[PDB]
Amino acid sequence: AGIRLTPKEIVSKLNEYIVGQNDAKRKVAIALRNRYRRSLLDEESKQEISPKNILMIGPTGVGKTEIARRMAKVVGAPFIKVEATKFTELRDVESMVRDLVDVSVRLVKAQKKSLADELIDQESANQEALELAEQMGIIFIDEIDKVATGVQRDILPILEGSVIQTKYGTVNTEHMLFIGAGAFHVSKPSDLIPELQGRFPIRVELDSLSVEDFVRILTEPKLSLIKQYEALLQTEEVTVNFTDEAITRLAEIAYQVNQDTDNIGARRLHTILEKMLEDLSFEAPSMPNAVVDITPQYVDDKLKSISTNKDLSAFIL
């Protein structure tokens, strides 16, 4: 019964994991809220309305996949992510639905437990996941601007509502929430087939990330990037401390290197962190119960000479 969450609560839940993107959090929340409102209606009306599918528009590294993935995680919905550019060949587009039933049974069994010890009725469990997927599932179709200007026609019956054959039974894709995402640098949403345009009533244009947005992505969300390296090096009994001046120095370098070559967004932070933490990671076992403080000087000693050379950056970080 996490479907009863009001939109304001979902925006608060999604703030614990995703920095900014307030505009994208509302439109994601009112799509879920419509699924709740649909169930409180009469049977002839509950079945003839269509979900408020979302069309996300923005570059990479802005966190439009986390907004959708965490969205299903908090409401307890089955989530799947498919790359639309894998279907361009000649295609079993319905595999995106059978994979949703495959992830729904694992979610239902996971919550059937905690409530090698199978004391749960597998039949009723599978038949609940079969219903949870078709009444609450979420399919994230990534890179959908690359099937626009053949593949959209096969995605259509899934959004239009069809009954797809799965190993556990038949599921109905009428009330599944669909999210399309892409950069739309060459094609526009108006270049999608008209049937797809009408079936994406909610559309959001996500914002770009500034150099001051990385320092939040780096420190703020629940289990951020540097929080991971703290707990990882804490396995080797090494306490790591990042001075705020050094976190800001990593954000200034990632944003700067995202400018010289090509912009990948917050994904740049992964290669930046591991590169600077290389000496610490290699020598961590032979350094027990130590306390290491990361200063901006130590950051520039390992990155500033590399981040200045553009030709080196395209390869090593």
Task: Characterise 143 by phi-psi region: left (phi > 0), alpha (psi -120 to 50), beta (else).
Answer: left
Q: Tokens 């879920």, residue? A: 32
User: End-to-end CA distance of the chain, in Å?
Assistant: 44
Query: What whole-number distance in Å separates Cα of residue 214 and Cα of residue 240?
Result: 20
| CA atoms within 13 A of residue 240's CA, in its CB half-sphere | 20
Give the orientation angle of helix 244-260 with respect to helix 211-219, to 10 degrees: 130
H helices of 236-309, in order, are 244-260, 268-276, 278-282, 296-308
Rounded to an integer, what distance in angstroms lies between the CA atom of residue 87 and that of residue 72? 24
What's the reported resolution, in angstroms, to a tenth?
Answer: 3.0
DSSP-based three-state secondary structure for 95: helix
Range of the domain at 293: 209-313
219 near 247, Cβ under 8 Å? yes
Q: Alpha helices, DSSP H only, in 40-121?
A: 43-46, 64-75, 95-112
* CA pair distance 79, 102, nearest whole angstrom: 10
| Of residues 91, 106, 98, 103, the one with CA closest to residue 164 | 98
Q: Please choose, from the candidates 178, 205, 188, 270, the residue with its C-alpha nearest in 3D space to the C-alpha of residue 64.
A: 205
Contacts of 314 (CB under 8 A, 6+ apart): 261
3-state secondary structure of 115: coil
Label residue 207 exposed, middle or buried (CB < 10 Å: 0-12, 13-18, 19+): middle
* Residue 264 phi, psi dihedral angles, 5° rounding: -115, 0
Buried b (16+ CB within 10 A) or exposed e, 263-297: bbbbebbeebbeebbeebeeebeeeeeeebebebe
Binding residues for ATP: 19, 61-66, 142, 195, 267
Tally DSSP H helices, then E strands, for the chain: 15, 9
Q: Do 178 and 139 form a contact (C-beta atoms < 8 A)?
A: yes
- The candidate with the shortest Cα–Cα distance to 136, out of 159, 111, 104, is 104
Q: H-type helices in 113-210, by residue range?
A: 122-136, 151-160, 194-198
Q: Give the 3-state secondary structure of residue 72.
A: helix
| Beta sheet of 202-205, edge-to-edge order | 79-83, 138-142, 177-182, 54-57, 202-205
Q: Can you tell me the distance from the alpha carbon of 15 to that of 28, in angstroms, rounded to the nearest whole number?
A: 13
Helix (H, G, I), strand (E, B) or coil at 6: coil
For 207, residues 6+ apart whose C-beta sits below 8 A from its C-beta are 20, 21, 23, 58, 62
The rounded distance, in Å, linking the Cα atoms of 15 and 18 is 5
Segment holding 56, helix H or strand E: strand 54-57
Method: X-ray
Q: Which residues are annotated as a binding site?
A: 19, 61-66, 142, 195, 267
Alpha carbon distance 92, 89 (integer Å): 10
Question: For residues 6 and 189, is the Cβ–Cβ distance under 8 A?
Answer: no
Give percent helix, percent strand, percent coil of the chain, each to the nearest 5.
55, 15, 30
Residue 291 near residue 244 (C-beta atoms within 8 A): no
Structure tokens at 219: 């420190």
CA atoms lying within 13 Å on the CB side of residue 23: 12
**241 membership: H or E segment, kind and range:** strand 238-242
Query: Looking up tokens 């992505």, which residue turns up?
Result: 217
The CATH number covering residue 288 comes to: 1.10.8.60
